[PDB]
Write a protein that binds this ligand. Structure first.
Ligand SMILES: *CCC(=O)Nc1ccc(OC)c(Nc2cc(-c3[nH]c(SCCOC)nc3-c3ccc(F)cc3)ccn2)c1
Length: 308
């Protein structure tokens, strides 16, 4: 009872795109930004190119290709989809460029201009993307504010599927982000869609604290014990008990008594219907919308380039 994954893996010619700037390096390889012009199409698509540095003795290509498999199989307005790979001397991943960066840095550099409407709408959009990942039977295992990209201040998407794993029709693994993981994932290394709900709760806490580090100043090894002791993250200042109660339910030890992603969408959508009743922010403000550099006459954002 498992459906055949008929997703298309588009191979892209290196001629078809031009790098422009380095958005960050280290760790893996390098992440560039640039434009992708499919030959004979007359469109320029802003993309983000991620290649593996010095792939002369890596064998981490089994890791980058696993991410490409996952990114090519997802299609949701709140999930980053792979545009294609390039099989040059270094393997490259090409996805849609998210101009405003990850939501964790954006929430820090704009904390004096982020309204309750924006915060509650982001929590709905992240929950929608996660609910879609649950439909496709995919467990993210690495949900956080750093792994949610901001296309516009009004549109965020879930990304970074390196740790992502496709369940059948309760995954057991054995480097992890300790402070975002559900208790079962620490002790038993069990990952479920409800283990993502815990990480979703930590992600919401990141946004309401405008980017504070969870458990800041605590060693990672001591987290397994204080969570069994009944301790959680504090109530952020702007958080009413209404919002913080939802954050608390995500952090319950009984994993099945946690909220479903389809329910988190509904609760935060009801609060986005009246944002200042649930988030108290001093002075509820505006957020920005851009063409950058060269001849941007035929520019098409990737969400409008659909080749079947
Ligand atoms: C806060 C983490 C972050 O990425 N911030 C950031 C800053 C500036 C940007 O462009 C203006 C973007 N846009 C973007 C980044 C990525 C991406 N990032 C990473 S690791 C962190 C390095 O920061 C760039 N990997 C990717 C990536 C994943 C899959 C793929 F196929 C290509 C690239 C993707 C899209 N847009 C973000």
């Amino acid at each position: 009872g498992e459906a055949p994954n008929q997703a298309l893996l588009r191979i892209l010619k290196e001629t078809e795109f031009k790098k422009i700037k380095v958005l960050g390096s280290g760790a893996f390889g390098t992440v560039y930004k640039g434009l992708w012009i499919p030959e004979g199409e007359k469109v320029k698509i802003p993309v983000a190119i991620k290649e593996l540095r010095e792939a002369t003795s890596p064998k981490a290509n089994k890791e980058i290709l696993d991410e490409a498999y996952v990114m090519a199989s997802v299609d949701n307005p709140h999930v980053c989809r792979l545009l294609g790979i390039c099989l040059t001397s270094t393997v490259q991943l090409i996805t849609q460029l998210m101009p405003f960066g990850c939501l964790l840095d954006y929430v820090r550099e704009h904390k004096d201009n982020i309204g309750s409407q924006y915060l509650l709408n982001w929590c709905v959009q992240i929950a929608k993307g996660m609910n879609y990942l649950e439909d496709r039977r995919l467990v993210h295992r690495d949900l956080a504010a750093r792994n949610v990209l901001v296309k516009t201040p009004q549109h965020v998407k879930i990304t970074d599927f390196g740790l992502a794993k496709l369940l059948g029709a309760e995954y057991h693994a054995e480097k992890v982000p300790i402070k975002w993981m559900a208790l079962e994932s620490i002790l038993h290394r069990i990952y479920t869609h409800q283990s993502d709900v815990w990480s979703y709760g930590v992600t919401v806490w990141e946004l309401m604290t405008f980017g504070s580090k969870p458990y800041d100043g605590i060693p990672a090894s001591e987290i397994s014990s204080i969570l069994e002791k009944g301790e959680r993250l504090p109530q952020p200042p702007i958080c009413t008990i209404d919002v913080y109660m939802i954050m608390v339910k995500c952090w319950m030890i009984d994993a099945d008594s946690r909220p479903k992603f389809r329910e988190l969408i509904i609760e935060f959508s009801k609060m986005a219907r009246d944002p200042q009743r649930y988030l108290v922010i001093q002075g509820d403000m505006h957020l920005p919308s851009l063409m950058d550099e060269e001849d941007m006459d035929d520019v098409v954002d990737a969400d409008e380039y659909l080749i079947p």
